[PDB]
Amino acid sequence: AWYARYPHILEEATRLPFAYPIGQYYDTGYSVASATEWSKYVDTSLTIPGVMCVNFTPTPGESYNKNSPINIAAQNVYTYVRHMNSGHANYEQADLMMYLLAMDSLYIFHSYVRKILAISKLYTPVNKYFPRALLVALGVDPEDVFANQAQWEYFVNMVAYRAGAFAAPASMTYYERHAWMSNGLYVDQDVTRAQIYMFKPTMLWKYENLGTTGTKLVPLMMPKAGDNRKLVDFQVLFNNLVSTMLGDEDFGIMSGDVFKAFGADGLVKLLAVDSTTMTLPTYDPLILAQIHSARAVGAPILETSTLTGFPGRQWQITQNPDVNNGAIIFHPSFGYDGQDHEELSFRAMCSNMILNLPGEAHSAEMIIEATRLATMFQVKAVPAGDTSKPVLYLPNGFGTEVVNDYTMISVDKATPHDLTIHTFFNNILVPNAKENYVANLELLNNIIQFDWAPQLYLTYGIAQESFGPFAQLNDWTILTGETLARMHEVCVTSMFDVPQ
Amino acid sequence: AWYARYPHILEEATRLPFAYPIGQYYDTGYSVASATEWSKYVDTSLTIPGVMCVNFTPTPGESYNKNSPINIAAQNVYTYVRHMNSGHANYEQADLMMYLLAMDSLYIFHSYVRKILAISKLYTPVNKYFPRALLVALGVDPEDVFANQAQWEYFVNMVAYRAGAFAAPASMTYYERHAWMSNGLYVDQDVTRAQIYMFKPTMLWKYENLGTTGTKLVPLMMPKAGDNRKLVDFQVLFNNLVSTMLGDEDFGIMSGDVFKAFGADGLVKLLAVDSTTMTLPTYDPLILAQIHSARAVGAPILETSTLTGFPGRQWQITQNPDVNNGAIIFHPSFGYDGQDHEELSFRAMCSNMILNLPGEAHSAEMIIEATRLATMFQVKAVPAGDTSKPVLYLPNGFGTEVVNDYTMISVDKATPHDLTIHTFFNNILVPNAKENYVANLELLNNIIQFDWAPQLYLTYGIAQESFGPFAQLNDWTILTGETLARMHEVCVTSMFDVPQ
Amino acid sequence: PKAGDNRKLVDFQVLFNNLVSTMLGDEDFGIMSGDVFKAFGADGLVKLLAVDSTTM
Amino acid sequence: YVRKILAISKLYTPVNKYFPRALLVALGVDPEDVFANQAQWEYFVNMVAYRAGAF
Amino acid sequence: FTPTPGESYNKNSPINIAAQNVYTYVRHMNSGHANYEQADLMMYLLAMDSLYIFHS
């Protein structure tokens, strides 16, 4: 060949600088020097996004009866605590189970602040997003972690010490699943300049035992991305979390009874951190499998949230013993977008989802673990009133965690190329504006930069027509709501299961 | 360990049919029962495209004086023919070189009709685009191949017999590249229900021999995908391809000189076909690398094409002994969209290209072979007149072939779900209309269904702003005009050569 | 270029381009070029040493 | 000539500080242009050898 | 004390020779980006020296 005869000309001809370090703006330049008269018609910008954050919410699953897996697990752990290990008989099954859920929220908070501490020591020349973009996506000021890192470390250690006052079973996979999910960095590819997936809890459950009418886990809001929160705000959040937890007699005898039934080696163990413990991003395909099938349900509903025609639709877990035979009722109203309007794009999520999977042959565990974060709407919630500004949807069942939002961190194409935060569901609405089509195209390109990005459903407001899954398909199926509800029931039963 | 002690429920809960055969419309249905009142706001339509045809054009490599690599190769092959072996003095070097260029067009046409005949025997139940969609994308009537298979077979055999009468050197790797490109299907993911890439000539060079002005090569059009031409149109094309070529007495004199110079074994031989010669799709990442880094230049300019301010910009490989010292002359003008107006989206190609490659370490052969189909504009061609409706762009030296446009085949949105043909460049213009945005969105989704799809530069007419490369970048670099011209000179010289 | 010139690469490219501007563009040049090849053989010719990053 | 221009610029010894800037000055080239554009200078000499070895 | 690159008034200074050598090793052997000269890389290395002096 000619290439074998003259390899020197081929070598000197094709020496190009590869491996551009992502994290800053790049300008391609002009091939035509007279193209400056067409200013916006030539796109010389080139931005590579680096961080996608999955804003998740811990849930016990769908529950409207006593036949829910949460109530079955409550009855089983109550039998193991009292009827086999001599309990105190000052509480029911549901009080113990809501106490266990409060433990889950505590361990999620500890893994969250441990990830916040461990992220800030990551520095590399090939990625300029490390570690400021991850701290921006977590809603924490990076200067407050640069300046007082030792205070952050000792606060994390003190959280791990104070969380050991109560007890929780180690063999329950719910705790270790939430702690592993909330404390990981997951690259979308096995390359040195990959993109970071993340899991930030926006919801934490706060114990609210007031009155005789039963306990309740009220919502507690976590810092959203772009809010520069310091260590004092996280300490205030932690003290608000254990305000009604420590100093409670019922919680004290519950911790004593769990410490009696399960041994000292049978309880969970929060690991101590120090100055040499840092985490690196790992490649997890099973994380990408459930990230791909993740379906957003929108921002949660609080007591302060105003809804026209929807009163009392807050995301609370109730423990009223006078109604429903004292069941742990938790079924929320989805589709709320954070404010009081119609949110036309959420109608695109009313079709049956497409379960996409890598490879050709799929095991049962792969299909079950790929549908952990999926949620399909089933029936519209009937409003109590003649006028209704939003539209809410009741699901047919969800897993141990739902997805509310997503967060994109990428460099801006305009001066001075700082980080931009883009919050979006799977559904993206593009209304009548000349500045919204190019922004939506840039958001689409930034989404498809990631490998297993969730399947979007873009609604165009000027054509009154939405679009299906905007993702590349390899081996897919159509999932009905009944089969996904069955898989969610299996997942919630297996996660809350404890061995006796 | 709930999955271990209850494996039957885990096995039964995840029995899903995953191998969905592409090639038909799929209605996912409504997950919410009352979502049928939202009309097009719930998109329950899912289509997977199957055919991407890359429409190319053979070129000598932008000759503009005697110092071009094609003229140097003409001098080298003329010294090899007439100085090393006792030849004739009736023909010059440029006549022999353009005879060799016309032999490439004849071999491309033979491989074209051979692929038309060999495609129609492809059938698999998991891909319903076989073989009707490939025959639609190749521009033939699919029913005419099935109804007249015996007349189609001997036509290809007679084309091979009447094109094998002349000689062309097999040591020259121009023919062994073009014939290998023009036949054979190329899957994009090496799976069973993969997507097929193709290569079809948009045009071919028909030999016409004039008097003292020269033996200039002329354009000859080819049927596009929405034509459904029968066998007699291809017979007419083959008849006027060699109408003034087989009727020339001096043609065989220089044809036999190649035979006696290069021997009887170092010649290009055409493979005869029978009823069992069936081609199969193969996986080649070398083809996908140059498919991914490909840039469209537009439709060729003909003598019948009307251009305001561009009277003599027709694509012709001229050779006049009177002017330019008897050199082969070929400098086409790109940027022609087929109509007599300026294509607004062609301004987006004035930025520097992005060479994206898989993996981390790239050899020099991979870099020089990944830039074969790319073509970058350098400077606008000066119009001859006070007004000009289109805008044409002169290249900085193109490679051995140029991509005109692309043809994409997919099933229809509505009844009866027949094949639809989409013709688009690398630049897609979305004008301000009611229904163009969702058509552009489904075009984008169908393009990103393909794995190594070319990078699209979408220009929006409402915002008067275009966007950069719409492709997933993995390991990329910015290519300037000078480096790509340096690569293209090497890639032109490496094909037009003889190692003796 | 003399010693007090500091010419760049493009000046040497211009010099090489107009060194063979009317030489590589001549049809009759290769006819007598190949005659030297067939007369003196392929081994009795002047060969130019190619260079790489280690030829010092 | 251009081969010696390319091959001179890799000469260095601590006992002779005229290497290689003074030789490139005496040959008439810019010494900084060889160092900044070594990859473009190398294939230029290779292409000169390729297009002069045709005859 | 004060960190210094040494005396330099010409291109024959050891600082410029080391700048040219490290620029050749970065670009001409390991495929650099060609957006900077030798001296920009060497002043960046001196800024690294001042950073490590501050850390120690």
UniProtKB/Swiss-Prot annotation, chain E:
Q: How is it modified after translation?
A: The 7 kDa polypeptide is acetylated.
Q: Which domain of life is it from?
A: Viruses
**Other comments on record:** Picobirnavirus particles are capable of disrupting biological membranes in vitro.
Q: What does this protein do?
A: The capsid protein self-assembles to form an icosahedral capsid with a T=2 symmetry made of 120 subunits.
Subunit and interaction comment: Homodimer.
Q: What is this protein called?
A: Capsid protein precursor
Organism (species): Human picobirnavirus (strain Human/Thailand/Hy005102/-) (PBV)
| Lineage start | Viruses, Riboviria, Orthornavirae, Pisuviricota, Duplopiviricetes
Q: What gene is behind this protein?
A: Segment-1
